[PDB]
Amino acid sequence: ESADLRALAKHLYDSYIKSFPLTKAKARAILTGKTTDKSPFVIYDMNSLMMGEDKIKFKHITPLQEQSKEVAIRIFQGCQFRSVEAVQEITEYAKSIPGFVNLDLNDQVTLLKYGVHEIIYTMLASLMNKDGVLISEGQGFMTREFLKSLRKPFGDFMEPKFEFAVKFNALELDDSDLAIFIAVIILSGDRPGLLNVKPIEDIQDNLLQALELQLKLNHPESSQLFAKLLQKMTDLRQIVTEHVQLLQVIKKTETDMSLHPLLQEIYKDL
Amino acid sequence: ESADLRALAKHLYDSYIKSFPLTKAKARAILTGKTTDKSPFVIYDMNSLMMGEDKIKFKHITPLQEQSKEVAIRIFQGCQFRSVEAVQEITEYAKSIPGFVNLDLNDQVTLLKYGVHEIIYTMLASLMNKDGVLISEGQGFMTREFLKSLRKPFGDFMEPKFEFAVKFNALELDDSDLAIFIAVIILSGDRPGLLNVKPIEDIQDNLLQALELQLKLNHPESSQLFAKLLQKMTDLRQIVTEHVQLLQVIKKTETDMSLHPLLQEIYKDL
Numbered sequence: 447e448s449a450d451l452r453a454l455a456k457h458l459y460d461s462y463i464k465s466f467p468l469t470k471a472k473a474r475a476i477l478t479g480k481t482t483d484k485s486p487f488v489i490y491d492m493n494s495l496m497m498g499e500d501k502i503k504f505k506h507i508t509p510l511q512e513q514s515k516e517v518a519i520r521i522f523q524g525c526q527f528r529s530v531e532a533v534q535e536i537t538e539y540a541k542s543i544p545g546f547v548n549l550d551l552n553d554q555v556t557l558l559k560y561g562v563h564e565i566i567y568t569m570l571a572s573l574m575n576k577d578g579v580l581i582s583e584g585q586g587f588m589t590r591e592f593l594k595s596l597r598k599p600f601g602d603f604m605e606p607k608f609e610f611a612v613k614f615n616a617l618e619l620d621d622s623d624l625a626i627f628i629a630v631i632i633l634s635g636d637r638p639g640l641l642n643v644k645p646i647e648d649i650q651d652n653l654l655q656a657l658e659l660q661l662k663l664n665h666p667e668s669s670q671l672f673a674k675l676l677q678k679m680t681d682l683r684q685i686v687t688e689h690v691q692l693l694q695v696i697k698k699t700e701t702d703m704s705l706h707p708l709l710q711e712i713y714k715d716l
Numbered sequence: 717e718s719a720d721l722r723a724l725a726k727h728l729y730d731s732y733i734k735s736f737p738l739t740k741a742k743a744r745a746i747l748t749g750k751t752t753d754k755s756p757f758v759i760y761d762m763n764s765l766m767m768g769e770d771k772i773k774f775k776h777i778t779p780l781q782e783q784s785k786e787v788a789i790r791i792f793q794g795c796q797f798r799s800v801e802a803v804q805e806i807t808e809y810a811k812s813i814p815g816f817v818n819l820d821l822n823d824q825v826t827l828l829k830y831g832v833h834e835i836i837y838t839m840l841a842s843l844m845n846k847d848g849v850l851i852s853e854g855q856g857f858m859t860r861e862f863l864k865s866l867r868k869p870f871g872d873f874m875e876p877k878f879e880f881a882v883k884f885n886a887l888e889l890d891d892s893d894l895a896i897f898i899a900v901i902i903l904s905g906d907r908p909g910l911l912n913v914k915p916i917e918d919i920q921d922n923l924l925q926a927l928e929l930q931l932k933l934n935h936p937e938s939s940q941l942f943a944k945l946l947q948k949m950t951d952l953r954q955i956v957t958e959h960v961q962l963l964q965v966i967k968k969t970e971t972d973m974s975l976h977p978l979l980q981e982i983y984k985d986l
């Protein structure tokens with residue numbers, strides 16, 4: 447019945463607003479939008495990034511370039527820190543999906559372990575446009591140009607995400623739609639090592655029904671939007687696979703030194 | 717009008733029967749036996765592999781294969797030849813999809829290049845069960861275990877296709893369903909390099925509707941079958957990307973390993 451489906455949609459949306467600080471609606475107004483107040487600090491150059499680190503809420507290290515902690519690495523570590531934050535926000539959101547907490551504990555951990563990356567890039571699109579990505583609670587904006595100019599390894603890091611985001615954003619989904627979509631992704635069922643796939647697929651089935659009805663009500667003039675969004679999942683998985691692959695090529699660019707432990711314990715391969 | 721969509725479905729199913737010699741219906745009839753007319757010869761070891769060129773027909777070597785073209789490499793060449801044959805059938809089928817031949821020629825090439833293997837693995841599932849796969853137009857059956865026991869690298873070319881097949885076949889789709897799905901796969905707007913995306917998506921939207929209706933009518937008791945089939949599109953990309961990486965390994969450890977120009981061309985990019 448559409449009564450449970452609309453209730454599930456409202457519930458997920460409310461939970462999504464609570465768990466995620468920067469919503470797409472919020473970020474959109476900032477990116478390609480007006481709101482002639484509090485504009486983002488634009489990191490487009492090596493010098494603009496430097497000054498950015500001393501004029502924006504930053505909690506990692508101090509801006510100094512002299513054979514000691516280069517820019518590229520300081521940027522890489524930055525996305526890692528925010529990433530660990532996002533993982534906790536997503537984990538909290540997960541526990542609000544009806545039935546999730548009732549699944550075998552190992553399966554909850556398994557579903558989060560393999561779904562968080564797919565979700566991170568999905569929500570990252572909300573903060574991106576063909577020219578750049580919002581940073582620091584939307585208080586900043588790092589251009590695509592700058593990111594794509596970093597060292598050989600770090601240069602083609604964000605590019606594939608910009609390509610995915612461009613295509614993903616062409617769907618013009620909003621937070622109410624995305625809230626359901628993210629839930630579908632978490633309740634996959636084909637993650638390796640799952641112990642009890644049945645309830646997971648049962649929940650996702652219910653979530654898909656909700657997503658479909660949501661898209662039909664929210665985008666009545668958008669033919670087969672349900673189908674198009676789902677096929678976008680093939681590109682996501684590829685983005686992720688590709689990304690973890692680069693992470694290995696990077697892993698061989700920082701390892702030794704008895705310094706930075708514990709901090710390296712927190713991050714790891716996430 | 718849902719009427720136009722049913723007409724489209726019949727058209728595509730019709731072209732599918734005419735383009736593919738071995739349908740899933742024929743495949744399951746051979747596999748589920750209960751027949752005396754089309755029982756296959758089973759290849760499960762070197763010995764039975766030998767007897768094979770005696771009951772069926774294999775343009776290779778029946779007797780010893782060590783000092784005379786290896787068995788693994790020999791079986792690989794067979795799949796190779798079958799593949800370019802499958803590429804031709806699929807291409808012939810592609811031409812029957814309304815609007816396809818009217819698209820910019822270059823885009824026709826792009827859609828085929830990126831779509832063929834996803835279709836090859838979808839259709840290959842039709843010829844598989846948990847224990848093996850049909851070969852030689854269904855006259856033979858080669859064991860999953862035999863395949864996995866081939867030389868170091870060759871021993872794992874098929875396992876991921878089998879793992880996918882068992883999960884895909886649980887959907888219990890029939891040729892009338894597959895025919896539309898295969899068309900949806902070809903008409904993908906997110907293929908790299910497309911010039912005119914819009915016309916391609918207008919056609920796919922039409923195919924997505926026909927597929928959605930077809931599944932509702934053909935699988936009344938199957939909840940969200942449409943969504944579940946579309947998600948499978950993710951497993952397909954992974955199979956392709958993985959197959960590609962294994963091919964590059966073989967190319968290097970087997971300097972005498974030849975590949976057909978057609979397959980090498982479609983793999984030239986990705």
Ligand SMILES: CCCCCCCN(CCc1ccc(O[C@@](C)(CC)C(=O)O)cc1)c1nc2ccccc2o1
Binds near residue numbers: 793794795840
């Ligand atoms: C959609 C039109 C009909 C398609 C029928 C596909 C039959 N087939 C597909 C599996 C396959 C395995 C290996 C393949 O690798 C190559 C390098 C060809 C050796 C390729 O084409 O990229 C390609 C394809 C396949 N057939 C067989 C027979 C015996 C063992 C394995 C095997 O795999």
